[model samples]
Target chain A: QGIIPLPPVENAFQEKYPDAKNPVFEIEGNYYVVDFNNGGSETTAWFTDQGIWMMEKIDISFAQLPAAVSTAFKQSFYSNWTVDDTYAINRLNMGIVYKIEAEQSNSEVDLYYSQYGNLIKAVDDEINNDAPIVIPKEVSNLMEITFANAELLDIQQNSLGYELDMIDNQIYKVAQLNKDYRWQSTTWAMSEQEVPQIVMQGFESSAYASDKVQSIYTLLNANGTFYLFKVSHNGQDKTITFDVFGNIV
Target chain B: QGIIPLPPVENAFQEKYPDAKNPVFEIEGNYYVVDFNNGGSETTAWFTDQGIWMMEKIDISFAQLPAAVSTAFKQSFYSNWTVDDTYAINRLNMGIVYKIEAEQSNSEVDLYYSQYGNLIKAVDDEINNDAPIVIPKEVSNLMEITFANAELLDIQQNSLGYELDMIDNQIYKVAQLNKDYRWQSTTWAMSEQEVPQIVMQGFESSAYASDKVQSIYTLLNANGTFYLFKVSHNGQDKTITFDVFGNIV
Candidate 1:
């Protein structure tokens, strides 16, 4: 907790992808996740608590997939499934791979393909249609206290902890909590106008005032609530976070 | 032949890849082939007469290959064969394919794999271990007149014409001829010191004099014999051709 106030992890992400646009940050257990757009592709990068990069997931169009990979999927038993998402996952030593999430009726699965188009694994999603989720007392209490009127759309338990999908003030949001029910981070898609006046003024007064704004996100963490502004100048990008009091966080 | 005297095609190449360094040009059939190193990889691009890019072949180390592709090769029928060359071929509508040439006991074959690692095609190299290559009388006569006493290493006939590999002045060279035995082009690798004084002087006096010379080549084409100086300044590259009389051609 002593080092929780520092922005070292975000700094590491900025150093690695200075050209990334509209980055959003979240804390999941001991890892920090950064999502952004780069070179016209939606990208997500995971980093350790100490700011070491772990892996990246990049969204790619189905048409851009390798021929063999596409062919394998098309010829598979689940060829009739409706595709939901396609991602190219990059990790150390593992090289590149494809992860396609497909659904048919109430069935959903994540199909993994090696770069050479061989289907390596197919994992059925743990969260299924109409399955009841029993939220723990402390976790539900924390969510109610933090986002009182928000509608909880879904909750999925991951290896780290609980992930809640909610609709707050008509904005979609995802909140994460540690296994012990301690709040990790909560982030939501936000419009520029929805950002608080103090945070907007803070951004306007900062060195990145001249940068072109790409995306904005409202982040709720342990210390306080903050607004993240992702901006770009020329080809370079930067993410600036400001507290409710207009102080750089 | 109306546009043969102009450098429109070369200009096209320069426009397409201004950062390409030390590109060596070759006329293969109806296509113009330009080979150069880009981004630390040996790259070869083929273009049409209008300078439209048709395909590109990039040399990538075997270790840099995708894991599945490498695995497939290791488990293949010729896993014990020694690999000679590996290339990632890029073509219009074809995407990317791996072309690995392997040899064993005087037997050589080019293995083609789809980007997804499936061995799509395997073709035995036409030039067998000891099959004598018959040189046409006109082709031999032309080679004798141009290269003089250079030792002819090998010759092979393609759809367009003849390709002769020779060792002239201790430097390896390849000379290409059309179906009618007309000399298409001849190229030889040479060092800076091997370049003629007049041609070197011409380069030293040119606008690209400050550029770093990457490679030197003696080019023998229909118009005249010239020295090609491939140079790079910063990240930009230019190929300067100078005649024997120190004139830029």
Candidate 2:
């Protein structure tokens, strides 16, 4: 077993909360994380590089929340919706902020509140739990510049940064952008007639020559540019992520 | 720095061609996994106890699969299904076994074959790349032996074991079994009326009581069973896995 040295941050926690159980300590860069169960509630407390407590996080019930926050929730725009559990985020700098999750039938929002029950910030919590996506102004501008005639279908932010789903000339296309606002990659669900010669040759050179080309989509990434071919090979649908320069990723 | 010491494993890999670039090694039990990008394919080669090459797992296309396996697949019942990309699992004891994943419209299956092209085993791959499902004889007996009156909904088997998705007397139930044919865990999507007092108490003490209990399911493992409450907190669905005996894993 690999042993992680306790540094003062963990020692301080152990001294303060001697009765705590399941204490899991971890270090990320300079910050330290102390995850454990205290008083039967699963708590995750963050510590400084020197091990001082910065914040302690645990789930909170609506009933357990401060009376002021509960009342504010009922009066705010979130009143008509249903209340899921909220987080009792006891922060050193910000004090106790209640990240209240309020949801309607199909939509939900995360509302941040102060210890005194003042609303601070609100962010949408889409059911998909995907990265918060605000269509990058440049993403829109890029579409206008290159795919001017493309009809927008959807835009989503995931781990791959941002993806803009669109349809140009009845063809589906996706534009991907990195977190730095750089257009990293793009894919087009192209028809057989639309696939580029280089992309077709790449797939042919790889192991997919005998399979039926269901659809081919081209991609552009930092490493290299490629065309993604989705084909039904044998009895399964296979996606061949291959570069136009003639390589499969 | 995450330091890794190299033993004969690194020397064996280096002695053959000390001219390689950027080689990293880690021990997984008796095998050493050397993960490095070599002539492409993000190669992952494993070394045996004495550092000889155990296996190399790489992705290959259907056309890259052995000709005999392809012919056998065409002649087998799997010919109707589309062959997804095949995994070239180059093993030593088995020579080379092709872990072929073939997909149907709704279901899929995994087939293992030797380098000489004899089918070793077939399994369902419904995890998109999982194998098909069949009611194991023991699972059938386990069902008839205990959950005789429970209405069966669906059943599937993965690489893990067997999962029996069922509904019993208006309540949802899922029984899991180990590869040894013993019952592992059982999950019940319990109705408000069907939940036990202890299970409800566990949830009440936890962080989810303030929110309306949309529904609660109960689970049972070797240690004990607990309640799995599925409630819409704030605006998102959350599953709180709490043990009635008092703990969350």
Candidate 3:
């Protein structure tokens, strides 16, 4: 009870997998992590006896893959690569460590394995795994403006939400969220029915893309019915329903 | 061809009765006529052989019988009759030539029969047998003052007959034959349930009695239920139906 001893601090190497083993190929006192095509091409990462970080190498074959995948990978992974040179480097540079000696057969393309293997198609994975960027409430609250008259069509509530079809048969999905209500309304050109067109104007007034002012309007029909609805800022709350016949229950 | 000659005029007395007996009701000329009572009284009219019109009282009671049958005869028939008087003369003259004479001894009244029986209550008989007076269309038309908001109930086929009911619940029977059209519209109080009290007013104003021209109107519920119908004029020939909403159907 005179002095109680504490446990020793754990190093990075002490946390290695129990089944980990050294590679067959060795270069500059470092073992290659991956050996493919009968060792003709390889990649490697290295750490010194003092656990100092070293250089890394990645090898790949652009001729073996499609031009699109190679171009996409080069545009995403490489820091400096010309449009012509993008096809030359089809492989990706994953995080790894290694070292090279100046005198050891500098003329030959020696195959060296990396501790972390080359990511041939890792750009897509990085993009997919990145955190989702949230849209600001104020930016999403910008309301869509629509000019109304007498002629309007039927209003329907479907699984998506409330829909308003104008006299010209243009459908508008009203989205009111705080201050950024947007016109997510879309129409198909070849849908047989004439799609009513909505003109959106004045978008350069705000910093946020969705915060820009927009005026949406359509032509009114003489004998058509219309409904004017006001939704809350959040777009989920509705105050009431107003119609030509006055307030309806 | 020879000109045709008119047939000789037949004597009414000879044509009516084939046998003629002297001292027994005889027709001596072409205009001979006889009057007989329900009792034994009798009278005669004829043209004498000298071509003079002549009349004789075969009986006095034959003329008095006509006046006695009238409703007005009770007071004016014989004003001076008494138990001892042999005959009492009637002063009330119905027509020229017709006179009422009562024979107290025989308990008989006589009518001095004239050529047309004018003296023997002949005027009263003419009145009793006269055709109804015809009402002119123009005179009938003037009998009523129609109102804009009022309804014409019916028009009489014979007289200037029109029925009207005012806004107030009153009924009246009007006719133009005798130049009589003005009558109390609400002459008779109507018997009905849920009847509304309506006051007569001017053309459009509810003011003085004269201004409150008679009209026939129906009291209707707000929902159009008929409560009562007050006819300011005769409503006998007209029929009206009310809808459930209290509107006239």
Candidate 4:
């Protein structure tokens, strides 16, 4: 098995889209995203861990949309705004819809329309898109020392301070700093197999033993490091924490 | 009928939460919210247009939570953080869940847990709460003349310019300005009965005549004033615009 083994989902994806060209897979939230080229157009599809297909997104020209959708859009209040990239979204519960990007000067919005010419929603896409991303020199200096070989993926200004997400030692890691640029904590995701047997045993012995574990992470701060297990059952979800020695914190 | 009448939802809400104390109603997005006191605690409930109960939020103490929820929280990584206002959220489709506010220095997160002690999600609540709100003096100066005697509800920095939401002449109005504080557009909600019969007839005769009408708005821009009809049918939604003379834009 590879380092990140999604055997069942990988098999299901291949069988479903056997002709996908140059597909690259990545885990995002609850879904596995596969980006590939379809008919010379950029395309992406999302699948659940159980191999259930969720959604498909295809980049397309505005003219490629259904005649009803295009005509309805041309008669909308946003008719004056210049159209940007258009996408056709097909999903399991949502069926098919068209998304048109409209921009007027610094304003940007995404308009969703149904195939039969119905307006579903208009979302303001520019609200936080231009929010400045500030990374202090001190934060970078600390990152250089603490995560020398890590590949930085994202940086954002947080309420408490600066937060950074990156790949450290081939593992996903998120680090947060105080407003004063002091290191607060660095947390990384962990796989179930990587966790200690004792820890798993402790969880099984607990009252919440029946709940299905969702994701696990290890958080390290000034005091010490602790393991966190996020679990859910039925419709309820919660997080439990334990020390390195398998003792509930 | 009273102003902002929502007869169907009002009837449904009254029948459902007949004991809600001193309920004050307000419209929020797609839901109608009612705030009141429940058993000496501040409580709020949300209902959809069809009067379907969406969720109930109650201000609660940490000790008031279910034993499993509180115990699980105390064993979590956030055990060291200072506890803020705790809430008991009973939502439709989601069932009962406890939301605990945890704060450490400047960082704050809301932890959601089920009654059986499973962590559902940990959301960073402080991310955008502390973003500085800047309203230039020039913008306020113009508001005095344009929207005189209006109750300003909110003002935010928009990418295109500054956007303001207010109650002008007892009607909900949203106005936008360019970077130079120059007036851009002023839009206000319009009732179906308030719209010109010609405009309604024009809509009825249009290609999208059969779609369900959602909301109507009158938009006055620098160029001219126009009517915007947001509609949805089945799973699809779209907007249509028409000029003051009843011609589709």
Candidate 5:
């Protein structure tokens, strides 16, 4: 299908909450979504704009939550968050979180909000549930309350899906560019439990979708064997099929 | 273990073939283990001073053999032909073929010597039932026969072991290598029917035994799924085990 142009922002949130008088501003940005209350509620929610409704109200203080819990919660929420859809604000937890549904009918959101009413992470249930629970470091860091870009070192694939490594101790998969920006895979936190002591990396890039792959590198085992697979991307749709017995199906 | 020094010349192949007295000279700059025979009726093979075989009395011209057959026979025979091993010499209308038994045990050789006794195309059974039949255009004009380096492309795990691609058309395997070197698992070849269309490159250096690897590259499917395996190599012994999944065992 052709590229679907982004919708114009007239009353972006009006259709969902028809009785609201004031024009609410619902803008999706690179990492988060900013929702201005206009004339309705006493609180505003900031969301990661991904599938899981990761929200944070301007009034709550994240300092109250334990560091580990906050860190784990942030990592878990963004592990399946994407920023490719519109949200309808259903309820607000004052300065802590906001409940919202996705514009796409079948989409579900995993909302993780901070005490101060800011959307920290949103996991799209549709995509996250379908794929493995692994997420790359770059994607996980984006879920932190003090969101930062993760240092991506390498990307690898095994029996599971992809594994991405951060500069430190993190590995997770970013929500691909499509599927309503849902972070549908597991992150390093979950992977570590399954494959501890193993340093893993997961990567999501549009480059793999190309029909012509220019160059590839691999390390062989002692038996002198090299294993490689072809990765192709059709814009939003990505497919990675193995070369069965060295033959691509 | 510590590195094993190269064996001394006097002790190399002397003890095994004491009565061998033939001295066969190799290409001027190249090296070979020659077996020389003094014009005696019975072949007496000896190692040349430079380690090549020197055989003088053995008829270079086997009667009725075609040129291609003669050439194939001589080259295959000289490369590593052993009478006591599983090696055989066969004659065919097109040319001569040499089949070295599994690791020098059950071998076969066939020659099609030309009427004038000139050698032409030569093939060996070691590279599978079929051999590299077509000579490249560059080598066609040259007086001597030679082969470009066979590069390893991809290694696919199968029922037997690993199938390696040297070029787009040529394949090898671990079992074949064991059969050729006598040292066990030194080389491999693949059947033609198992080759893939999109042949990858950049495998020559990467697949060498000296390269230690941490992970292998794999293509995740549309759902982003793949497998991982563990491999270990200790000089003379190498083992590959499936750690995760993508058909590696």
Candidate 6:
């Protein structure tokens, strides 16, 4: 596997992926693989010796995905669950296919859909069976920089990367990490019923936080860190996200 | 223009629009107009005499949009503002172009972008310049169902549809209407300063309602109604939403 390019294949690939960037090329027998970022997606595509597009694997962002795909999955058999991760497989003759990882509570399902938004199949595995977490070495880097006092409870690989479930000063925090072994996001599942008084007070101090807090997730990125919350007030479904410190970043 | 039968044109259109639904075709001069719905978007497209693709117009939904398009607009010079309405104009030669209408207070901007997500232009318009609203006939249909006592304040035409600015029994509300004069969404811009006693009390009863209420919105659908609140509280940016009656939907 190394970086060597065939001009015809490169041109054809670019025509299909005009947004491709920083692609690293590798050859495996009669196949070639192009791994790169396209519109923020880490994608790997396999082309045959004949230059026919064979297959592709993309680590997709749920937010950046086409709403049609989301709606189709949600309204389909996989209702009542939120999409956690999407891995798309684009096959040449078989057409583009998708494997969506959906989750709600301990329940999890991996759904396969056709290019036409039809659900091909559904499968259920252990689905975050609350297994023991192996704290990645990088967590120490984060622990020193961020959660200095949090005791590592568990760590495991998630769809996009990895997550560390921890408790700090009695507050439950899920520190998210990327495949690069770097922190990406965090979720403070701290609660008055489950966490200490200080943590609950700090969460309540947030502008839109309520006593009926359900869950709060913080997306950490170089651009900035932001929060997404789910709170139940009346019998309705609502959505909210804002930047840190009273800003809409 | 009338819906006509042209199988050849239909095939050609499908070549370009594999997902068009219930297309009603009309021959306009040497061009053919194909009007249809795609993923909940009402769209119109034109083709040349030889079935060559021309241009297309899509009545887009903000939630259903691709994050690439959304982020493109936000990160450009048009950052910080919210998307009011989006109309995508796709031309064959220009690739896919977007005409995004964004809102910020009373000011308005129309942003044009190429298929490659480049900002082609930005046009600032005196939006919502305190114009009088001639309530669409269907507004009577909505007002009678809810907000019956809202004193008519203002109504005007927007790119996507119409807006009715009203104060219902001292609670300021902005009712949103679709292109067909159907109620779509509603916004409550009530501040802690001057809302009615009942409205204030009602707002206060919110689990986390803050004194500095930024904005509240209700997505009106046949299934049920839910409210989203943006508030400034305790110097932290937070987000929360619940259904009416203090229930998190």
Docking quality class, candidate 3: incorrect
RMSD of each: 29.3, 22.3, 45.0, 21.7, 21.8, 25.9
Of 2 and 3, the candidate ahead on DockQ is 2
Q: How much lDDT does each candidate structure score?
A: 0.71, 0.65, 0.27, 0.72, 0.30, 0.61
lDDT per residue (tens digit) for residues A40-78 in model 5: 533333333332333323322334444543454344422
Q: Positional deviation of B199 in candidate 1, in angstroms?
A: 1.8
The digit string of per-residue lDDT tens for model 6 on B1-249 reads: 467646677778888779878888877666778789987789888777667676778887765456766767655544555677777765542234567887665446787654435454566654522111234567776777876665544455789797766655544466778788777777664444544454445556653443355565555566565555665543333344555554534
Residue ranges of candidate 5 with Cα displaced over 4 Å: A1-157, A164-249, B1-34, B37-249
Question: Which window of 10 residues has the lowest lDDT sum in candidate 3 chain A?
Answer: A100-109
Tens digit of per-residue lDDT, candidate 3, span B25-104: 33433433343332343333343333233333333333344453322222333322221211122111111233444432
Candidate 4 per-residue C-alpha lDDT over B1-249 given as tens digits, one digit per residue, 9 for 90 to 100: 222428887887778777767778877777777877877889887777878777778899988998988888877866766798788776553346678988765457888776656565577775313111234578668767877676554455679987775656656677888888788999987888999988888777764565678789999997798999887654345678988877777
Better of 5 and 6 by TM-score: 6
Worst 10-residue lDDT window, candidate 6 chain B? B126-135
Report chain A TM-scores, every model: 0.48, 0.46, 0.18, 0.50, 0.21, 0.37
For model 5, report DockQ. 0.02
Q: What is the DockQ for all candidates, taken in turn?
A: 0.01, 0.02, 0.00, 0.02, 0.02, 0.01
Q: Write the per-residue lDDT of candidate 2 for residues A149-184, one digit (tens) a residue.
A: 875544556787776666566555667777765687
The best-first sequence of candidates by lDDT reads: 4, 1, 2, 6, 5, 3
- Return the candidate ranking by TM-score, descending: 4, 2, 1, 6, 5, 3
lDDT tens string, model 1, A114-229? 55465556676554221113456785686679878766544567888877766566566778888886778888767868878877887777655666787888888888898888
Error of 6 at B22 (Å): 28
In model 5, how many backbone clashes occur? 120
The window of 10 residues in a row where model 1 chain A has the poorest summed lDDT is A126-135
iRMS values in order, in angstroms?
29.8, 14.7, 57.1, 15.4, 24.4, 18.0
Q: For model 1, how does the per-residue alpha-carbon lDDT over B139-158 read when each residue is reduced to its tens digit?
A: 66876798787666545678
Q: Between the candidate structures 2 and 5, which one is better when assessed by lDDT?
A: 2
